[PDB]
Ligand binder design. Structure first.
Ligand SMILES: CCCCCCCCCCCCCCCCCC(=O)OC[C@H](COP(=O)([O-])OCC(O)COP(=O)([O-])OC[C@@H](COC(=O)CCCCCCCCCCCCCCCCC)OC(=O)CCCCCCCCCCCCCCCCC)OC(=O)CCCCCCCCCCCCCCCCC
Ligand SMILES: CCCCCCCCCCCCCCCCCC(=O)OC[C@H](COP(=O)([O-])OCC(O)COP(=O)([O-])OC[C@@H](COC(=O)CCCCCCCCCCCCCCCCC)OC(=O)CCCCCCCCCCCCCCCCC)OC(=O)CCCCCCCCCCCCCCCCC
Ligand SMILES: CCCCCCCCCCCCCCCCCC(=O)OC[C@H](COP(=O)(O)OCCN)OC(=O)CCCCCCCCCCCCCCCCC
Ligand SMILES: CCCCCCCCCCCCCCCCCC(=O)OC[C@H](COP(=O)(O)OCCN)OC(=O)CCCCCCCCCCCCCCCCC
Ligand SMILES: CCCCCCCCCCCCCCCCCC(=O)OC[C@H](COP(=O)(O)OCCN)OC(=O)CCCCCCCCCCCCCCCCC
Ligand SMILES: CCCCCCCCCCCCCCCCCC(=O)OC[C@H](COP(=O)(O)OCCN)OC(=O)CCCCCCCCCCCCCCCCC
Ligand SMILES: CCCCCCCCCCCC(=O)OC[C@H](COP(=O)(O)OCC[N+](C)(C)C)OC(=O)CCCCCCCCCCC
Ligand SMILES: CCCCCCCCCCCC(=O)OC[C@H](COP(=O)(O)OCC[N+](C)(C)C)OC(=O)CCCCCCCCCCC
Lengths: 137, 155, 183, 506, 192, 78, 105, 49, 80
């Protein structure tokens, strides 16, 4: 299988990257031509954040962290299913039973993280209600 | 003009001067890409794509995920080029001169009429011959799922 | 399978640059002690078209050529040089026959293979004509070992997987035989 | 039986409500699982049949009578450790409830026992790397099981980094071996034991030397052991050495086929250096766990001399030493988990901050234990006297047997240094005995009611109220008399070690 | 060294269960009720909380029975396996095994059973499950396949021992036994 | 193949952001690549020097063992 | 025993035959020692790295240098760019020297 | 086609990837190479017989 | 050059920079295995490389989890 046609494509796309950047740099009118008030550098008002107009100045939930952390074990489970795809016929029943076992052990992990509700954001800080109880004497 | 040398010299230049964690994560991506590209050509196209799918797609974006969580806070040109040049001189990883100067070939044969990809053979052996290695791996993955939750989960 | 090797042509010229591949020739012919043979000159498509007729005609020599490789015990290339010329001569015999008996039936079929990704499933109409011609003029038949006669794939009247695009020369030649022969 | 029950405990623990009683009851389910494992193991595995060595699972795992000895030992020591987390070590709810605050504690321990028991059996470089990670990953999780603790998490971070570098060295040696030979099975490599770079197996040992805390790598182990909770340090400072030292012994068995002297000189350089640091290091220390970390390094140095010598007497020296040292280690740490009830309470100077993770942290917190509990003080005295090497305790026979193996192979220099290093280390074992008893007669008649044990409620005032729980007391007493009275059955035990073979045969 | 006759180096899972002695079922029963008892015995030894005996909650007793249900079976499975390997008393099983095999060869069926697994898959399966009961205390693995690498010589099932000739079984030459390696490679030397 | 696409773009930003160092690293790279195409042997000599200073079998050393054997295997034919 | 040296198509690769002959000798029962198998061990290492054969190529390169033999006349003709495997070079009767198509098969 | 069998450029030029206990011994220790050079020498030492 | 331990200059001054160096170090081991396996036409070396990539991923996840909890442990006032 030849890939010299593919190589020229990758090279052209690499050339297309330089063209997109520089075409802006050669077609925009000179700062003097428009208003001359300054370049992007000195014009710090124009080169700044957007805060809807008013100038101002990540303790993320642990549930978000466990979403990203648990992505890695579940990704290596999916990527290790790749060898079974292109060899499903020649491993027969034996490799099919092994594959199912390879999935059951990982599912017991899915059960564990489903019961603990690890991914739920939860609301421990707020949403409290109480019963007004009179304390007659 | 083996341009793969110039990519690493740039990479070796920025590894000596990186200060924050943004550049440190950049050295990771700037190292896999030469690893993937030098595997795509030459040695193994299958493991170039496995590296992209597993390293870049899975373990690299996790680094930048936690860097946004951790924090973002806070040499001389002569010594760097002197060090890089000194690092550049001696690049022979092995000292078997004949093994590095004499070329070899293989002879093909037509005895293998059932031609199938490497990933076909790897699955053929991993799911039959070394099914213990495959099963322990799912066991190591299982411990991580439990291991991540016990370390990080608050309550 | 498009794995890189050290034994044939690789995917791209960037593989060659990394490996510093030299494509080396050897002008030296074989020594006169080994009697010469006329090598087969057919390309990929004609061989895949006549493969089952080489199997039908050179079956004894192919088996004997392989049995020499099994029992040479690692010295196969050197100790089977004489038995390897019978196979080359036998296979040249078949291609020479197809050129002098079924030249148009043969060419039609392997033009179809060169038109349809060298797949047997896409060229059944041309292949059926070639098999019928070869049988009457050389007595060779196509047989796939290991299955009953009634369940061979190339005799399947209504195949599940059929060519997407038709070969014009195959469809035209087929219906002509539906008049010449199906009287 | 271990693996199948682990899945049941994983699922069941994630169902039932988070509570201490249920967490403690699940810890008693694991104590059964480990017991059941030992009964099934001893039933099928016999010394008489495993003598030849038997390949299992496509030759990935090879089991013989030397490995089989340690699997049963590992299972036994894991029973004595689980007894701590499964029963009361003090009975005071404040101190004890730490052991029951984590539900995955017993699960991670059961993960490690699978990792520990399979490591000596490995027979393929592909499975060597996988199994060593299964054990290594389980230790990091156990070190960080108390995720609220700042010191515990700081230690697991230090443990993970050092182990990751250690595992990379192990992985790189195997790759280099595969580069030279193209073979993965260890038996196939033995066919080329004369044709490969024998120093690439030494690079493998340098990775396993980091994981047992051998100098110059000793620095991290001392820091880790002095920061983790005493219940955690009781496990991570003993178990890895049980399964790695067995593996190191086997790798050295194959190495001595070609009998390369340069390999032996480098290892002797590390053994010699470690004895120096293991002895002179502990002289100036205040923390008890830092003291037992230097003590651990010295004993690993002794056990490597038996490994390095690697003769027929080296099997006996190693097999006996690894057993007696485990029981001594369990006995000492079990006592330190108990005698925390005798600590005084303030009603000041030096502002010593104590936490519920290491209630006993300094050596002078052992003061006057001869007064508060004389019987347990002698048990700690007998245990320390074994570490010193005073006969006829178990500790003497370990050093005596190690010396036989060392001198029989010409390691004269190392034998003398170990006898110098033993005496230097006696200084800081004697300090523990000085603190235990020497100020008895001045404190004999004192008005003590501010001890931690005096905050225990009075139940009835008529029935007898024992101060220490039942199970922990029986373990301490049993292992103290076994240490003390080994002379009675020593001849049978040693003759029971002559039979443990590693391809000796005839 | 207590050595006996090697009935089967890799006994099949279904065979090992069919060869349980009554005592083996007792061990399986004892293991099943031992684990719930061990939980109770610990509470008698020492209460989990407080100072007085308190029966553990029924939920713990159900999970305890399951854990002891597998452990009892594993102990039963390994004890039954020692007999096949020859490590234990196997005279009773040897006659029972010989009766089945001599009957099997007589019907021209394979003693080992027909198999979906091809030659490589049969031999590969044997490698995984042979001597796998030695680590059955760590993780489970059973021979559930009808392979042919059992570590016996089928010639030894032709000779008649004491009390066997009365069976009057006729044994054909192995070359005519269906699904054996000595009866398959008749057309090609690499295809069965 | 991703470095084929990225290499043109990264080189532009390498010179734009840090031109002076980029000249040297590109200057250094071209110096050795030319020496390989023109056989200046400057990198070969440092390799042949390093092997001598660290005890390795150099190309000269291997050839010497050939000459000792050359003379000796001829000397028997005397 | 476990399979080692499996080719990219599931069969024995180039050097499996040598490795198998080593295992036959080492595990043989008629051998008192491992001396007879020492040559087979060298062949398996030789099959994989060709270190001795590469060394032989080094002397033949070095011996021709000291004799002045012209490399182009002792060596074998070669082509470095695959596009210039032209029919003139391949020896075809009426072959041009125009480049060949190695873009897409 | 004849091609070389040298390790990748990244494996032998990266500022970090090239550092390893065994890669230094391949690069800076003669122990391995002197042992193997004996076998090459003894090839031509055995042509006399 | 690397005998003076130059690679220590190339590793940054954060705990996350150590984690990356461990990955780049192990990456060299896998690339070495893929190199040998392809030359020998041996798929057993490719099985090893596949395991090394999968095992090197699990090591990253555990290390980051410890680092993440290490970070929030300081920022654990949460008395708002
Ligand atoms: C079935 C239901 C069951 O077995 O347990 C009920 C159990 C009780 O549910 P619950 O009402 O929430 O329990 C409340 C009690 O307090 C929970 O306490 P519990 O004591 O009442 O039940 C917990 C259970 C322990 O639960 C388990 O061990 C289930 C293990 C499955 C994994 O312990 C037992 O009761 C022992 C008897 C059943 C155990 C089954 C062991 C043989 C394996 C089949 O439910 C489950 O655990 C469901 C787990 C099954 C998940 C799906 C697995 C699918 C796998 C196959 C799919 C592909 C083919
Ligand atoms: C940290 C790492 C952890 C690693 C461990 C993780 C867990 C892994 C361990 C799990 C097991 C590992 C092995 C799995 C890989 C092997 C798969 C395989 O060989 O496929 C080929 C195999 C086909 O080979 P075959 O030549 O056709 O043999 C036919 C029968 O298998 C055999 O024919 P037969 O002559 O033995 O008798 C046929 C008839 C029994 O015929 C009789 O003689 C009657 C016996 C009376 C009943 C005995 C009591 C039944 C059980 C209690 O049916 C049976 O009972 C066969 C036994 C299978 C029943 C369930 C076995 C559970 C074991 C687990 O595929 C199967 O049929 C396996 C079926 C069982 C499913 C797998 C069991 C686990 C789920
Ligand atoms: C298609 C091209 C894509 C890349 C475009 C950027 C090219 C510029 C050169 C950087 C890439 C070279 C590879 C080595 C990494 C070096 C990263 C670094 O040190 O910082 C570069 C960048 C600019 O900062 P600089 O002034 O150069 O350094 C001092 C700043 N305090 O500091 C920054 O972080 C600014 C944002 C840059 C983010 C780049 C992310 C890393 C690169 C990944 C994409 C390219 C992958 C590597 C391909 C080449 C490998 C040699
Ligand atoms: C509790 C201790 C249980 C001891 C059980 C030891 C055992 O059963 O195996 C002994 C083992 C010999 O076994 P083997 O040679 O392989 O052949 C026979 C197998 N049927 O011999 C061995 O080699 C095992 C080596 C480890 C032995 C450790 C010594 C036991 C220490 C006793 C600790 C007692 C603690 C007090 C228990 C309190 C309980 C509340
Ligand atoms: C059948 C599988 C589940 C067993 C459930 C049946 C059972 O044993 O009940 C639990 C038993 C008595 O039930 P109990 O809770 O007292 O009555 C309801 C009061 N609210 O409470 C107990 O005392 C526990 C007795 C356990 C009996 C054995 C359970 C075996 C479970 C199957 C294991 C294999 C699957
Ligand atoms: C467990 C169920 C066991 C019963 C069963 O169905 O498996 C037996 C079956 C045998 O089928 P059979 O055609 O008779 O094989 C001999 C042919 N010469 O075996 C088979 O053919 C297929 C076995 C598949 C059963 C596995 C499903 C369980 C889930 C896997 C995990
Ligand atoms: C593709 C886009 C097609 C339509 C847009 C073309 C407009 C750009 C033409 C231009 O820039 O012409 C004006 C220019 C210069 O004058 P300026 O105003 O300073 O240029 C602004 C851009 N510089 C300053 C970056 C160059 O003249 C020439 O260089 C004549 C040639
Ligand atoms: C075939 C022989 C089997 C013998 C029995 C074995 C199981 C022990 C359980 C008995 C019942 C029980 O626990 O009874 C309870 C007693 C007494 O407890 P106490 O301290 O007075 O608590 C206070 C009791 N109140 C509530 C009445 C006040 O506990 C014991 O004496 C425990 C003895 C230690 C265990 C011995 C095992 C030795 C292991 C040796 C192998 C290495």
């Amino acid at each position: 299988m030849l890939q010299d046609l593919f190589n020229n494509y990758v090279i052209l796309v690499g050339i297309l990257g330089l063209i997109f950047l520089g075409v802006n740099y050669f077609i925009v009118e000179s700062p003097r031509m428009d208003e001359n008030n300054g370049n992007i550098s000195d014009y710090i008002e124009k080169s700044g954040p957007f805060e809807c107009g008013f100038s101002s100045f990540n303790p993320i939930p642990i549930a978000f962290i466990l979403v990203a952390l648990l992505f890695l074990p579940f990704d290596l489970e999916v990527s290790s299913m790749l060898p079974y795809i292109v060899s499903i016929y020649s491993v027969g029943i034996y490799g099919l039973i092994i594959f199912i076992l390879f999935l059951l052990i990982l599912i017991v992990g899915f059960i564990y993280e489903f019961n603990t509700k690890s991914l739920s954001i939860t609301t421990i800080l707020h949403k409290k209600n109480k019963a007004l109880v009179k304390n007659l004497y | 003009m083996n341009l793969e040398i110039l990519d690493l010299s740039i990479l070796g230049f920025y590894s000596l001067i990186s200060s924050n964690s943004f550049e440190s994560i950049a050295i990771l991506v700037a190292t896999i890409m030469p690893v993937i590209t030098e595997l795509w050509y030459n040695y193994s196209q299958l493991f170039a794509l496995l590296y992209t799918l597993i390293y870049v797609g899975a373990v690299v974006i996790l680094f930048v995920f936690i860097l946004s969580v951790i924090n973002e806070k806070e040499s001389g040109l002569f010594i760097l080029i002197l060090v890089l040049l000194l690092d550049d001189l001696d690049d022979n990883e092995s000292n078997d001169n004949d093994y590095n100067n004499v070329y070899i070939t293989d002879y093909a044969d037509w005895f293998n009429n059932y031609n199938e990809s490497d990933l076909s053979v790897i699955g053929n052996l991993l799911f039959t011959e070394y099914a213990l290695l495959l099963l322990i791996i799912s066991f190591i993955l299982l411990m991580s799922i439990i291991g991540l939750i016990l370390i990080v989960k608050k309550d | 399978s498009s794995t890189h090797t050290n034994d044939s042509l690789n995917s791209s010229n960037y593989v060659d640059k990394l490996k510093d591949t030299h494509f080396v020739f050897e002008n030296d012919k074989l020594p006169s002690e080994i009697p010469d043979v006329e090598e087969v000159g057919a390309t990929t498509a004609p061989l895949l078209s006549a493969a089952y007729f080489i199997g039908a005609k050179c079956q004894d020599y192919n088996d004997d050529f392989m049995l020499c490789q099994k029992e040479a015990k690692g010295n196969g290339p050197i100790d089977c040089l004489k038995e390897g010329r019978r196979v080359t001569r036998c296979a040249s015999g078949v291609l020479k026959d197809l050129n002098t008996h079924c030249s148009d039936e043969f060419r039609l079929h392997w033009q179809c293979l060169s038109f349809s990704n060298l797949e047997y499933k896409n060229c059944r109409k041309a292949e059926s004509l070639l098999n019928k011609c070869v049988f009457e003029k050389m007595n060779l038949v196509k047989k796939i070992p290991g299955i009953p006669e009634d369940r061979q794939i190339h005799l399947k009247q209504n195949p599940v997987l059929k060519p997407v695009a038709l070969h014009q020369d195959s469809e035209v030649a087929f219906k002509k035989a539906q008049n010449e022969n199906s009287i | 039986m271990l693996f199948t029950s682990l899945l049941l405990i994983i699922v069941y623990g994630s169902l039932v409500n988070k509570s201490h009683l249920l967490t403690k009851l699940i810890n008693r389910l694991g104590l059964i699982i480990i017991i059941y494992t030992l009964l099934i193991h001893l039933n099928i595995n016999t010394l008489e049949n495993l003598s030849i060595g038997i390949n299992m699972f496509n030759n990935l795992l090879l089991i013989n009578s030397f490995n089989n000895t340690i699997i049963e030992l590992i299972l036994i020591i894991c029973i004595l450790y689980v007894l701590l987390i499964s029963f009361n070590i003090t009975g005071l709810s404040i101190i004890d409830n730490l052991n029951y605050s984590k539900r995955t504690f017993i699960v991670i321990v059961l993960f490690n026992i699978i990792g520990l028991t399979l490591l000596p059996l490995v027979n393929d470089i592909m499975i060597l790397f996988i199994i060593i990670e299964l054990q290594s990953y389980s230790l990091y999780l156990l070190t960080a099981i108390f995720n609220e603790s700042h010191n515990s998490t700081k230690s697991a971070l230090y443990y993970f980094i050092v182990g990751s570098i250690a595992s990379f060295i192990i992985l790189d040696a195997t790759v280099s071996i595969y580069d030279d030979l193209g073979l993965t099975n260890i038996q196939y490599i033995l066919m080329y034991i004369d044709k490969l770079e024998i120093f690439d197996l030494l690079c493998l040992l340098f990775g396993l030397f980091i994981k047992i805390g051998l100098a110059p790598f000793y620095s991290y182990s001392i820091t880790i052991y002095s920061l983790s909770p005493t219940i955690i340090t009781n496990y991570i400072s003993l178990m890895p050495k049980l399964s790695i030292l067995t593996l190191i012994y086997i790798i050295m068995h194959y190495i001595n086929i070609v009998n390369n002297t340069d390999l032996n000189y480098v290892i002797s350089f590390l053994i010699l250096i470690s004895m120096f640091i293991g002895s002179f290091g502990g002289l100036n220390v205040i923390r008890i766990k830092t003291l037992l970390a230097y003590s651990s390094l010295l004993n690993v140095s002794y056990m490597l001399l038996a490994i390095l010598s690697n003769s027929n007497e080296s099997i006996i020296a190693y097999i006996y030493y690894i057993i007696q040292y485990s029981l001594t280690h369990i006995n000492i740490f079990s006592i330190i988990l108990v005698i925390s009830i005798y600590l005084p309470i303030m009603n000041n100077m030096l502002n010593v901050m104590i936490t519920k993770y290491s209630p006993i942290e300094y050596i002078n917190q052992l003061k006057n234990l001869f007064i508060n509990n004389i019987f347990i003080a002698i048990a700690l005295c007998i245990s320390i006297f074994s570490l010193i090497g005073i006969p006829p305790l178990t500790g003497f026979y370990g050093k005596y047997l190690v010396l036989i193996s060392g001198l029989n192979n010409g390691y004269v220099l190392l034998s003398i240094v170990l006898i110098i290093a033993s005496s230097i280390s006696t200084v800081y074992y004697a300090t523990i005995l000085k603190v235990l008893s020497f100020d008895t007669l001045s404190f004999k008649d004192i008005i003590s009611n501010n001890l931690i044990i005096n905050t225990s409620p009075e139940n009835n005032n008529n029935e007898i109220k024992p101060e220490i729980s039942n199970v922990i007391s029986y373990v301490i007493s049993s292992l103290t008399l076994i240490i003390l009275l080994i002379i009675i059955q020593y001849e049978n035990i040693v003759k029971g070690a002559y039979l443990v073979l590693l391809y000796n045969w005839v | 060294m207590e050595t006996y006759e090697l009935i089967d180096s890799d006994p099949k899972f279904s065979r090992v269960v069919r060869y349980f002695r009554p005592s083996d079922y007792l061990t399986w029963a004892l293991g099943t009720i031992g684990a719930p008892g061990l939980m109770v015995l610990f509470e008698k030894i020492e209460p989990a909380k407080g100072n007085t005996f308190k029966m553990p909650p029924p939920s713990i007793m159900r999970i305890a029975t399951t854990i002891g249900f597998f452990g009892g079976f594993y102990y039963a499975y390994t004890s039954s396996t020692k007999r096949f390997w020859g490590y234990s008393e196997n005279a009773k099983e040897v006659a029972k095994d010989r009766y089945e095999v001599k009957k099997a060869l007589s019907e021209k069926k394979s003693p080992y059973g027909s198999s979906l697994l091809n030659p490589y898959q049969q031999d590969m399966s044997a490698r995984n499950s042979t001597n796998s009961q030695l680590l059955l205390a760590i993780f489970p693995w059973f021979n559930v396949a009808n392979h042919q690498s059992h570590g016996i010589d089928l010639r030894k099932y032709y000779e008649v021992r004491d009390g066997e000739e009365n069976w009057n079984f006729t044994l054909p030459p192995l070359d005519q036994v269906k699904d054996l390696d000595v009866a398959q490679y008749k057309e090609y030397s690499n295809y069965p | 193949p991703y470095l084929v696409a990225f290499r043109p773009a990264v080189l532009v930003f390498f010179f734009i952001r840090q031109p002076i160092g980029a000249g040297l690293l590109a200057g250094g790279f071209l110096f050795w690549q030319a020496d390989r195409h023109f056989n200046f042997g400057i990198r070969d000599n440092i390799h042949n020097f390093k092997q001598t200073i660290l005890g390795f079998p150099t190309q000269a050393s291997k050839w010497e063992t050939f000459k000792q054997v050359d003379a000796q295997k001829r000397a028997q034919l005397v | 025993a476990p399979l080692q040296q499996v080719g990219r198509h599931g069969g024995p690769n180039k050097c499996f035959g040598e490795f198998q002959r080593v295992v036959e000798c080492m595990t043989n029962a008629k051998h008192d020692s491992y001396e007879p198998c020492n040559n087979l061990k060298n062949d398996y290492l030789e099959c994989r790295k060709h270190k001795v054969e590469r060394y032989k190529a080094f002397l033949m390169q070095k011996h021709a240098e000291e004799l002045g033999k012209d490399p182009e006349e002792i060596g074998a003709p070669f082509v470095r760019k695959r596009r210039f495997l032209t029919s003139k070079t391949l020896g075809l009767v009426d072959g041009d020297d125009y480049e060949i198509g190695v873009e897409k098969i | 086609p004849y091609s070389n069998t040298r390790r990748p450029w990244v494996l032998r030029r990266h500022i970090i990837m090239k550092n390893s206990p065994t890669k230094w011994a391949r690069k800076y220790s003669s122990r391995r190479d002197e042992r193997e050079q004996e076998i090459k020498d003894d090839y031509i030492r055995g042509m006399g017989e | 050059m690397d005998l003076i331990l130059l690679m220590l200059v190339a590793v940054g001054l954060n705990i996350i920079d150590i984690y990356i160096m461990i990955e780049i170090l192990i990456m060299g081991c896998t690339v070495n295995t893929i190199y040998s396996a392809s030359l020998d036409n041996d798929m057993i070396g490719l099985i090893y490389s596949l395991i090394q990539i999968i095992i090197a991923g699990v090591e990253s996840a555990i290390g980051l989890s410890i680092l993440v909890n290490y970070n929030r442990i300081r920022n654990s006032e949460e008395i708002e």
